């Protein structure tokens, strides 16, 4: 029977090995955490670039679509308007039975478009095909840049109303503020989540749960110190967010 | 190639040699007009309770009344004995198309509205140098979807040369919406 | 070896133990994972500089990337060379002495 309980001697080696192991299984945790952060950052950037590439592609697609639609409508107008194109097309077909005005007008409008710099252009139904197409171009580009870039109004708001009202030479700390500081934090979570930056969320750390009284003298030294690290880190975050925005 | 095609090829390849087919062509044109203008001869071949005796007698006597050729009679007796006489006008038109195709095509052709004698001359001479077929008897038409540029079909089926405005336009547009 | 310390647990000391166990599992689920592929991500900007037409914001983003990876590798090589923890290692040593004081009791037999 007692041949059972011979196991009960091996409940002391295990704890020596506990102390020997946990001071190494932890040193091989910080490394993995670093690499975790690297991986998440890289993946975020990659998804950002896939999105921006797809947006550019769909822009140019819609662009050439309208570039064709408007030239076609313009020609459908000019033909029915002008008498000359009729007899010119007659002669064109006749000599073709052994250039037509359609290819000519298309090529002409394209050549006149290729050196326009559509950024410098006018409103939507503005007649000239360049004025018809550059409206779409610029509007689509604006609806593009607002989603993979920050807006100057969001900048100005906080830069002039929020950050520098705290303090100057370094923009030191943040207890000098209203509850609406929390909104600035929310504002943070917009910008980096459209641009695609990966910043550590400090609050993903979790404090300790007490179990027994004998541990009370340790946990507090952690949790107190943790606050001294959680808030401090916060400052070293937001100053950056300010010193891009001055 | 068809049944009426069979009889057509038969009589053509047999009669082109000695018969002076133009003679047969004229006789068959006379027969075709008699068909279209009788309304009893049409009935007559439709007339199913008629004796083959009376039919053969009618034909043999019709020989001695109008112009007539021997192979014509042989063919008529053939379509009698094979019970294939109602196909006569169809084979007649087949032979007309065959011979006039040997000589010269008839073609359809489209515009928007009335063109001019000048460009009409240009059209015919261009289509002649394209065909190089010494006989061409054409058609004029007016369909305004192809806006004004001259679309047509030189009648052989596999050549509908679509010199048009709207067609080239739409083909080009649907082409240049391609990706990159 | 300390993971084979289960059967010396009692139901009054189970959930705590389970917590500990699951805690370690979390750690291990990280580590092996973050050493299995090694480094397959390693993005190459030669492709993206070409495939993109703006090349004005791409540059600043890449700058951020190369500015953070330096500090990551810095911290990594820096930790690869106190008192805040001894206050708990004392608890551990007390527990060790207690467990020896109990195993000696159950080594009479």
């Amino acid at each position: 029977q007692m041949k059972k309980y011979a196991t009960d001697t091996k409940c002391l080696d295990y704890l020596s090995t506990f102390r020997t192991e946990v001071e190494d299984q932890i040193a091989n945790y910080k490394v993995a955490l670093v690499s975790q952060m690297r991986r998440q950052l890289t993946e975020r950037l990659v998804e950002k670039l896939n999105g921006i590439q797809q947006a550019e592609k769909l822009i140019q697609g819609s662009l050439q679509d309208v570039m064709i639609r408007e030239i076609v409508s313009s020609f459908k107008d000019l033909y029915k308007s002008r008498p000359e194109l009729h007899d010119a097309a007659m002669q064109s077909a006749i000599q073709g039975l052994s250039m037509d005005p359609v290819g000519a007008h298309f090529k002409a409008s394209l050549q006149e478009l290729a050196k326009v710099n559509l950024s410098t252009a006018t409103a939507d139904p503005m007649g000239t095909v360049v004025q018809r197409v550059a409206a779409v171009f610029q509007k689509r580009e604006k609806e593009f840049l607002d989603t993979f870039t920050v807006k100057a109004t969001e900048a100005q708001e906080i830069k002039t109303i929020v950050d520098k009202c705290h303090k100057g030479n370094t923009f030191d700390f943040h207890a000098l503020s209203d509850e609406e500081l929390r909104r600035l934090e929310q504002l943070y979570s917009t910008v980096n989540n459209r641009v695609g930056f990966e910043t550590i969320h400090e609050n993903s750390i979790k404090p300790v749960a007490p179990l027994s009284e004998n541990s009370k003298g340790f946990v507090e030294f952690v949790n107190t110190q943790l606050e001294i690290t959680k808030a401090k880190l916060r400052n070293a975050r937001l100053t950056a967010f300010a010193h891009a925005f001055v | 190639q068809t049944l009426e095609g069979r009889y057509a090829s038969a009589l053509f390849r047999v009669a082109k040699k000695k018969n002076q087919l133009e003679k047969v062509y004229g006789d068959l044109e006379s027969v075709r007009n008699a068909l279209k203008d009788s309304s009893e001869f049409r009935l007559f071949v439709d007339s199913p309770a008629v004796s083959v005796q009376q039919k053969l007698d009618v034909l043999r006597q019709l020989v001695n009344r109008y112009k007539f050729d021997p192979l014509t009679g042989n063919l008529l007796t053939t379509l009698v004995e094979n019970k294939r006489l109602p196909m006569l006008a169809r084979v007649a038109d087949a032979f007309d198309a065959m011979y006039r195709k040997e000589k010269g095509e008839v073609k359809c052709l489209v515009t928007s509205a009335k063109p001019l004698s000048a460009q009409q001359q240009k059209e015919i001479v261009a289509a002649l140098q394209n065909r190089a077929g010494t006989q061409a008897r054409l058609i004029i038409d007016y369909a305004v979807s192809p806006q004004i540029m001259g679309g047509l079909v030189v009648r052989l089926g596999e050549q509908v040369l679509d010199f048009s405005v709207a067609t080239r336009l739409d083909r080009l547009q649907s082409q240049l919406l391609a990706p990159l | 070896s300390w993971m084979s310390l289960a059967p010396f647990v009692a139901p009054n000391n189970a959930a705590a133990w389970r917590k500990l166990r699951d805690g370690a599992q979390e750690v291990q689920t990280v580590i092996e994972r973050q050493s299995t592929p090694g480094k397959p991500q390693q993005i190459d900007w030669a492709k993206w500089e070409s495939q993109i037409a703006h090349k004005d914001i791409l540059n600043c983003l890449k700058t951020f990337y190369t500015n953070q990876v330096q500090i990551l590798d810095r911290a990594l090589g820096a930790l690869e060379t106190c008192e805040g923890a001894e206050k708990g290692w004392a608890l551990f040593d007390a527990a060790l002495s207690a467990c020896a004081k109990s195993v000696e009791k159950s080594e009479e037999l």
Partner: peptide
């Protein structure tokens, strides 16, 4: 990729030639 005005328009112009 490519840019619209200077590249794509030239390309499409080069694309249109065709008859018969």
């Amino acid at each position: 990729a490519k840019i619209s005005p200077s590249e794509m328009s030239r390309l499409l112009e080069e694309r249109i030639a065709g008859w018969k």
